[PDB]
Design a protein around this ligand. Structure first.
Ligand SMILES: Nc1ncnc2c1ncn2[C@@H]1O[C@H](COP(=O)(O)OP(=O)(O)NP(=O)(O)O)[C@@H](O)[C@H]1O
Length: 344
């Protein structure tokens, strides 16, 4: 059993392992694919102890196996034991991507052309995801992979859900998992994040972060996240408040001192004015007024790339809720076993 740091048993076919990160349920290595003669990425996942780990792992696998898109990371192979009894770990083999936008923004200035092309690819992948009735719900720079030729692939569908706008409403201050800094204001107010508009907010946050190499709304906690948003957008309008019927959320917003909108050109004086027009439309407080993915693709900022015939949609949308919250981990291990069978 070949070792890294732990068992990383991808054995004969996958060799010359190099540690390139850790994280959720396992650890990530690069490896030489002795069959296909390319370096690949391998994610070891060890989730079968914890129901919640098994949910995230089954979601990621089910979604990434169904999706086929140039801007979404695919699964090339899956390594696991031939029996459920022997299966402790699952190895997911993917295209090796040189970096992610998080690592890139820590150290590199992006040209206006790079910002434009990266946003185009994010929205092109997102159009496919949304067309499949799926919400990503955790878009952030670390979940956007890039290779040496600036090809961008969305990854990490662990928090992804089938869209359910009918059942989106909830109380004030309802608990949430996805990264605070990329959470739409309605999450803190009255939304479960079951509508496509929560992904467009996250893209808007990522566009702002590409324009300055700093998170635009770096809240330290839940209400601080809302003060950061309202610090730039200003106090919500009467019309936007009238949309918030939940009294705890409405009265919280009414309690706050009046704030005027800060103009995007003050925050980003060297930005392309078309980029700031699109940023404004993505970071709209009211999710009903917020631009949709297909409208963002058609925005003048993206006119060099925009080609709706080359912006494919999903053949096989997820019609129905993935009924995973109440499956015991033993059922979820069986589903993961069945979902991975095609690679044996
Ligand atoms: N296909 C890939 N190619 C290269 N590096 C990758 C790839 N997928 C993930 N990584 C990196 O491996 C490290 C750990 O992976 P991680 O950031 O956890 O990826 P993820 O797919 O978003 N999964 P996770 O965050 O654990 O739910 C990070 O430095 C990632 O950027």
């Amino acid at each position: 059993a070949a070792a890294a740091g732990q068992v990383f048993d991808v054995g004969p076919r996958y060799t010359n392992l190099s540690y390139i990160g850790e994280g959720a349920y396992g650890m990530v290595c690069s490896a030489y694919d002795n069959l296909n003669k390319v370096r690949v990425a391998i994610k070891k996942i060890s989730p079968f102890e914890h129901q919640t780990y098994c949910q995230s792992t089954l979601r990621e696998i089910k979604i990434l196996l169904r999706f086929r898109h140039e801007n979404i990371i695919g699964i090339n192979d899956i390594i696991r034991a031939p029996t459920i009894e022997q299966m402790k770990d699952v190895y997911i083999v993917q295209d090796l991507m040189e970096t992610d936008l998080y690592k890139l923004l820590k150290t590199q200035h992006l040209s206006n052309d790079h910002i434009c092309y990266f946003l185009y690819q994010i929205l092109r992948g997102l159009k496919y995801i949304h067309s499949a009735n799926v919400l990503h719900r955790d878009l952030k720079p670390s979940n956007l992979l890039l290779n040496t030729t600036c090809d961008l692939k969305i990854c990490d569908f662990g928090l992804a859900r089938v869209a359910d706008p009918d059942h989106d409403h909830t109380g004030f201050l309802t608990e949430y998992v996805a990264d605070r800094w990329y959470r739409a204001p309605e999450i803190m107010l009255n939304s479960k994040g079951y509508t496509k508009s929560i992904d467009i907010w996250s893209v808007g946050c990522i566009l702002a972060e590409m324009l300055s190499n700093r998170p635009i709304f770096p809240g330290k906690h839940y209400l601080d996240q809302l003060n950061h948003i309202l610090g730039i957008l200003g106090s919500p309008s009467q019309e936007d408040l009238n949309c918030i019927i939940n009294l705890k959320a409405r009265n919280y917003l009414l309690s706050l001192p009046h704030k005027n909108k800060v103009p995007w050109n003050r925050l980003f004086p060297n930005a392309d004015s078309k980029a700031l027009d699109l940023l404004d439309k993505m970071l709209t407080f009211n999710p009903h007024k917020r631009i949709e993915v297909e409208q963002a693709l058609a925005h003048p900022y993206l006119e060099q790339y925009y080609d709706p015939s080359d912006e494919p949609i999903a053949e096989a949308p997820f019609k129905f809720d993935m009924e995973l919250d109440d499956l015991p981990k033993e059922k979820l291990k069986e589903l993961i076993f069945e979902e991975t069978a095609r690679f044996q």
